[PDB]
Amino acid sequence: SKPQPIAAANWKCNGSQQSLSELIDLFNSTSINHDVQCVVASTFVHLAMTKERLSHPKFVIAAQNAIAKSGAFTGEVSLPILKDFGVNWIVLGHSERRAYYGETNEIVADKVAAAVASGFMVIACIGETLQERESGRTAVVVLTQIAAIAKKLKKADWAKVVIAYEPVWAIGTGKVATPQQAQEAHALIRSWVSSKIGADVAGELRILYGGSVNGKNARTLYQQRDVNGFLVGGASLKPEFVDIIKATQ
Amino acid sequence: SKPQPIAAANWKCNGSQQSLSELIDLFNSTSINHDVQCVVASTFVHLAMTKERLSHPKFVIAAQNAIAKSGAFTGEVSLPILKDFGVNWIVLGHSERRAYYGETNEIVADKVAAAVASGFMVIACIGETLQERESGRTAVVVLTQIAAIAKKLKKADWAKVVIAYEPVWAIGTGKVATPQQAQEAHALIRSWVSSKIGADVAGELRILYGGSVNGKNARTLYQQRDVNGFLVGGASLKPEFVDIIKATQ
């Protein structure tokens, strides 16, 4: 027994009206019979197109980031802007942002808290690098990530929160994450939640796997006890994303 | 016998569908008899609405930022995506970016050269901080900034470039630069261009002034030999912007 899964496509900084339209079409046409929440995270630019086109009842739209408040922040998009715009899902704290864009544990927590406050469903991303991993630091980093988020949230807030564990150590480093290793990272998070906030919250909490997921390994990943679905990059831009939705039965 | 001016509205991180639409109906209503190029820079999110609704022949839409290449940059939007969407103008190197999100002289330079290679018209911001000004480093600060950009550009490239002089201490404070302060800044930049690139280039280059420009102060500003228009934040959210447009011929 598990909560409702989530299949999240993070298109990243990719796209084209043409291509996406076509993908959208494949998605709407998809027959989805179980209870799963599908999420499409498009560039900020694509959002309008995406909303108009996605008619599938099991799909919602999400943005790939935001700043907490409007103002003099050239190039940035804030929560209010998104709220007025009918967007209610957000991806926050993604590792690419953590790495290139100065996103500390603190900035992430703030952004999350800010989002929860304003009503958004948040997919917050945590996860360790090969360095931290190699040095025996997996636990300290992950728990420190989740603890930083957690100091700005009340028990009630949790219902607005989804966690994505990103195996950074396995991303673009040449290493392979196995299902066992994913599961362990997940169980760990769940332990902290269950132990810090509460058992009820813990059982309801969705922990997505945010590593390498393809149509062939997604079911074996799903088959693990603390895997609640996926946050997807590469295969999200492909028809394969369809098998990934299915793998959550 | 000054190059065609520019009145650029920098919305920064602000707006709602309702409010921007109003501004747009306002702009669409306004008649401008002189050779002037007006620019609206809105949030990525609002590019759609802007492009569909803005009908005035003297206006163009702009993006407030971008990165050079598509790929795995969660939260970002590339040049390729913008060009696919109909956007050919872009504001780069804004101080708010340099300050908050770590955009160094090199990073900006890279973004400019790229943008220029993709056929965009680019408004590149340079300017000094309160601190630098008080130290007497102004001339050094600005020449270095411009020089970083010049490095990556070839002579013909310049036909696509616009420089915006935004003294940081003047950004959204009410502390406008006086005409003398803005004209000595603008002349300095242009003497470097003529010296380094060529007199022709300097003669054609547009150098914009930003920093607390408003309906009232715009005229005198513009009256300066080396002032070719403005790049406006706060006042661009108001009907006042209309008066700013009128001050520039």
Ligand SMILES: O=P(O)(O)OC[C@@H](O)CO
């Ligand atoms: O006109 P302000 O004072 O809002 O500042 C404007 C610029 O920083 C944007 O180009």
